[PDB]
């Protein structure tokens, strides 16, 4: 069942651990590195400089490590990096960084990126994230761990999707989504916290209730942004889980000297 | 002159009626059955167990019969079934069922499914439906006959699109769409009935007027849901066409004992 | 370092200037003409009658010059035309015209059409336009020069996107967008003029201020449409830039005899 299909193209410069597979008609461009036990499906296109970790499954029609088309980037020799145990479904596009930001697009471990999703220049994904069909990260988007972006979720240049956060389908996210928050619609608004994926992480009930309290503070008490960050302080010493939520909201607003 | 391109891959286990064609670089995975007079374009990917009926036209970059990525499904050996005279345009994805629901994703006859559309695990399509570009059925979605989903229509797990119904472009359907109803926007709201595709079916004028009356009852009289189902009763004996509309609304709301 | 890959398929009827390149597994259907210095990536599909100008870059999974699926078109032998210095990113679909309108889909010069974008039957694109990821022109859409459609912008049959206009991401454009106007959301509303791409064109400050005045007139003074066209008259003699804006608004409303 013999590993690297002969109908596939591998650059001499590319370099692949022993038990990597490549389906037919797939291209492994120059400067592409593929870690142990990874599988490249048929009709894939890898371009470098790109570093793909161990035990990844990448499917057909996927164009992983292409240049961003954005005119900003004029071909400077930037990187893409993918961790281990990731799944990249049919037709996904992942673009390498631009020198303008950190010169690298980056994906962690255990992520599920479903069909026709896009991950633009300089975006950065943590672990156990799910990007559903046609989710699109315009560029320099940071997605912290466990986040779930429902189908056709759109995320504007530079937004931070905090951890365990959740976008509903057709969400149009123009600004940061705090840890644990559920957001919906065009343009994205906050609704609740994601109690779902909190029970899934086996959070204590005190921690859940405390996170509801925390939501209520920010949003439904109309404190200012600053006013609420202040309130949470207590809540956040008490519960590392809340801490995260305060910390998300923190480094979204620095504001100016009024 | 030559039917099945030599550059295409056909599993020994696959089985294809005499005058089937397959374009180059297309893969017909194991357990894939293709009925009389069907045409598979170039760069297609079929995976099984999948049964494709007669006189279908499937285009390039289409991944028909892949497993749903949803973690729910752990590889149990489920099915896809496609009827006759269907068209599947460029880049369509169709996923086979999960044992959790009916273990089968199902498509009827005479359907037009346009480019980059998605038909998730366990979805079920009738006949003469049109799914326009990038329409997406999250899973277990039933689309009854003649329905038209305009481009980039999104349909949440388990929703029923009643017959002759119509979604506008970028519709975000979170709940059932009754027979004949036009819905628009994010989130989808009702606007009118689809008089268009009623004239197309050559409905009697009494039947059209009766269907307007019926709409008005449900929606624009603010009867309850139950209250309206009651009203329609008369309307629905009188006109098989209305009957359908009542029947759609019926088995969307069972409610609980208050 | 010999230009047309041997694993690619070229119709004898197709015709390609000397220094054209074609990547592997790409098909150049009959009646396809490709101008000097153009590059066709791997796994592309060209179909004709199609005329592609000079120095274009077309990427993988792109299906350029296929028939529109719309049932309106019954195979009449219509055309696609693409100018020079265009970029067509991964997975783009471009459909040839229908005899019903002008029998031709048309693209000018220096345009950037990003991944998974769609350009339906009879649409018409000027120069230096950017269509971002998954932008979709349903059909007979005219996009005048310098226009920018942010990602997942949807444009209903027959709309005119005036020059330097700008749609935000997930915009759902059901009606004309005047020159220079910024529109956002579902359904698209007007917000501002696109001062951005005005500074980019090096417009005089008088011209910018005059264009703000002009916006204010149409929209924020609630003159009628006709009433405002009247006002602009002066503004529009004075400034060719305004002229454009009046002219966009003009041939969107002919109205009827009341
Ligand atoms: N609101 C809501 N609740 N459950 C869901 C499912 N889901 C998100 C999801 C979560 C986990 C997972 O594995 N897949 C999808 C979606 O994005 C629904 S929309 C969708 C799903 C699959 C394919 C394409 C689309 Cl548009 O949506
Ligand atoms: N408002 C409205 N009424 N009819 C239309 C056309 N249509 C629906 C349609 C009708 C017939 C058919 O054969 N295909 C699509 C659309 O989906 C419009 S949006 C669209 C069309 C083609 C590709 C992609 C998109 Cl976003 O738009
Ligand atoms: N409001 C706003 N202003 N600029 C933007 C960014 N932009 C447009 C853009 C403009 C020029 C260019 O070369 N690339 C992107 C977008 O399409 C944002 S959404 C996006 C971008 C790239 C891929 C996919 C998506 Cl959804 O959004
Ligand atoms: Cl709440
Ligand atoms: Cl409380
Ligand atoms: Cl009505
Ligand atoms: Cl009446
Ligand atoms: Cl009324
Ligand atoms: Cl020029
Ligand atoms: Cl110019
Ligand atoms: Cl440009
Ligand atoms: Cl014209
Ligand atoms: Cl002034
Ligand atoms: Cl004002």
Burial of A179 (0-12, 13-18, 19+ CB in 10 A): buried
Chain mean position to CA A7: 32
Count CB atoms within 10 A of the CB of residue A61.
29
SS3 for B233?
helix
C156 touching B (Cβ < 8 Å): yes
Residue ranges lining ligand 1, Cβ < 6 Å:
A 130, 132-133, 148, 150-152, 168-169; B 70-71, 118, 120, 136, 138, 154, 156-157
SS3 for B207?
helix
The answer to whether C180 and C213 have CB atoms below 8 angstroms apart is no
Prior bond to B253 cis, omega within 30? no
Q: Phi first, then psi: what are they for B128, rounded to 5°?
A: 55, 30
| CA trace torsion C129, C130, C136, C139 (10° rounding) | 10
Q: ∠ CA(A172), CA(A197), CA(A113), 5° rounding?
A: 55
Residues of C forming the active site: 121-122, 139
HEC secondary structure over chain A: CCCECCCCEECCCCEECCCCEECCCCEECCCEEECCCCEECCCCEECCCEEECCCCEECCCCEEEEECCCCCCCCCCCEEEECCCCEECCCCEEEECCCCCCCEEEECCCCEECCCCEECCCCEECCCCEECCCCEECCCCEECCCCEECCCCEECCCCEECCCCEECCCCEECCCECCCEEEECCCCEEEEECHHHHHHCCCCHHHHHHHHHHHHHHCCCCCCHHHHHHHHHHHHHHCHHHHHHHHHHHCCCCCCCC
The answer to whether C184 and A168 have CB atoms below 8 angstroms apart is no
SS3 for B247?
helix
Q: Which residue of C has its CA nearest to A172?
A: C170
What is the Rg, in whole angstroms, of the alpha carbon atoms belonging to chain A?
20
Beta strand A130-131 with A148-149 is: parallel
Of C59, C91, C170, the CB nearest to A154: C170
Chain mean position to CA A102: 16
Beta strand A189-193 with A181-184 is: antiparallel
Which CB contacts under 8 angstroms, 24+ apart, belong to C5-8?
Answer: C5/C42, C8/C40
CA distance A245 to A218: 10
Nearest CA to ligand 2 atom 17: B150
Q: Any idea which ligand is nearest the CA of C109? A: 9
CA distance A197 to A191: 15
Q: Residue C133: CB partners within 8 Å, gap ≥ 6? A: A93, A118, A136, C89, C114, C115, C116, C117, C151, C152
Ligand 1 binding pocket mutation candidate from B121, B131, B156 (most atoms within 8 A of CB): B156
| Torsion region of C42: left, alpha or beta (phi above 0 gives left; psi -120 to 50 gives alpha) | beta
Residue holding tokens 């791409």?
Answer: C197
Where do runs of H (alpha helix) occur along chain C?
Answer: 195-200, 205-218, 225-238, 240-250
Query: String of b and e for C191-223 (b: at least 16 CB within 10 Å)?
Result: eebbeebbeeeebeeebbebbeebbebbbeeeb
A152 touching C (Cβ < 8 Å): yes
Q: Which residue of C has its CA nearest to A170?
A: C170
| Strand partners of residue C46 | C28, C64
Is the Cα dihedral B119, B123, B125, B131 positive or negative? negative
Q: Any idea which ligand is nearest the CA of B87? A: 2
CA distance A94 to C247: 41
B189 touching A (Cβ < 8 Å): no
The answer to whether B129 and B148 have CB atoms below 8 angstroms apart is yes
- Cβ pair C43:A25 closer than 8 A: yes
| Torsion region of C222: left, alpha or beta (phi above 0 gives left; psi -120 to 50 gives alpha) | left
Structure determined by: X-ray
Q: How is the beta sheet containing B21-22 ordered, strand by strand?
A: B21-22, B39-40, B57-58, B87-88, B112-113, B130-131, B148-149, B166-167, B181-184, B189-193
CA distance A211 to A180: 8
The answer to whether C80 and C56 have CB atoms below 8 angstroms apart is no
Compute, in angstroms, the gap from residue C241 CA to the centroid of ligand 3.
Answer: 25
Tokens linked to A35: 């870690």
Total residue count of chain A as it appears in this document = 258
Residue ranges lining ligand 3, Cβ < 6 Å:
A 70-71, 118, 120, 136, 138, 154, 156-157; C 130, 132-133, 148, 150-152, 168-169
What stretch of H or E contains B211? helix B205-218
Q: Which residue of C has its CA nearest to B116?
A: C116
Count CB atoms within 10 A of the CB of residue C5.
16
A187 touching C (Cβ < 8 Å): yes
| Strand partners of residue C160 | C142
Tokens linked to B63: 């991944």
Q: ∠ CA(C196), CA(C199), CA(C201), 5° rounding?
A: 110
The answer to whether C38 and C52 have CB atoms below 8 angstroms apart is yes
Q: Residue A209: CB partners within 8 Å, gap ≥ 6? A: none
CA distance B177 to B252: 9
What CA–CA distances, in Å, run from C101 to A227, C124, C141? 59, 12, 11
Q: Phi first, then psi: what are they for C110, rounded to 5°?
A: 60, 20
User: Has B122 been annotated as catalytic?
Assistant: yes
Distance from CA of A172 to the nearest CA of C (A): 7
CA distance C65 to B25: 20
The answer to whether B161 and B177 have CB atoms below 8 angstroms apart is yes
Tokens linked to A10: 């591998």
């Amino acid at each position: 069942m013999s590993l690297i299909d002969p109908r596939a193209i591998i650059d001499p410069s590319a370099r692949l651990a022993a038990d990597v597979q490549v389906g037919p008609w797939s291209i492994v461009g120059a400067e592409v590195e593929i870690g142990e036990g990874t599988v490249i499906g048929p009709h894939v296109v890898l371009k470098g400089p790109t570093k793909i970790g161990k035990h990844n499954r990448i499917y057909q029609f996927s164009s992983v490590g292409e240049d961003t088309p954005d005119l900003k980037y004029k071909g400077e020799p930037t990187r893409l990096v993918i961790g281990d145990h990731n799944v990249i479904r049919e037709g996904v596009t992942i673009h390498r960084g631009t020198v303008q930001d950190r010169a690298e697009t980056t994906i962690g471990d255990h992520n599920l990126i479903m069909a026709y999703a896009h991950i633009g220049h300089d975006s950065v994904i943590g672990n156990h994230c799910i990007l559903v069909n046609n989710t699109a990260l315009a560029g320099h988007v940071h997605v912290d761990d466990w986040a779930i972006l429902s189908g056709y979720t759109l995320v504007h240049q530079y937004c931070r999707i905090g951890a365990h956060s959740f976008s509903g389908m057709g969400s149009a996210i123009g600004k940061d989504v705090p840890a644990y928050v559920t957001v919906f619609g065009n343009p994205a608004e906050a609704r609740s916290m994601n109690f779902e994926g909190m029970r899934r992480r086996g959070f204590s009930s005190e921690a859940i209730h405390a996170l509801r309290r925390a939501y209520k503070v920010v949003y439904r008490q109309g404190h200012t942004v600053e006013e609420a960050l202040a309130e949470l302080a207590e809540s956040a010493a008490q519960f590392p889980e809340v801490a995260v939520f305060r910390d998300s909201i923190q480094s979204a607003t620095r504001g100016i000297t009024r």
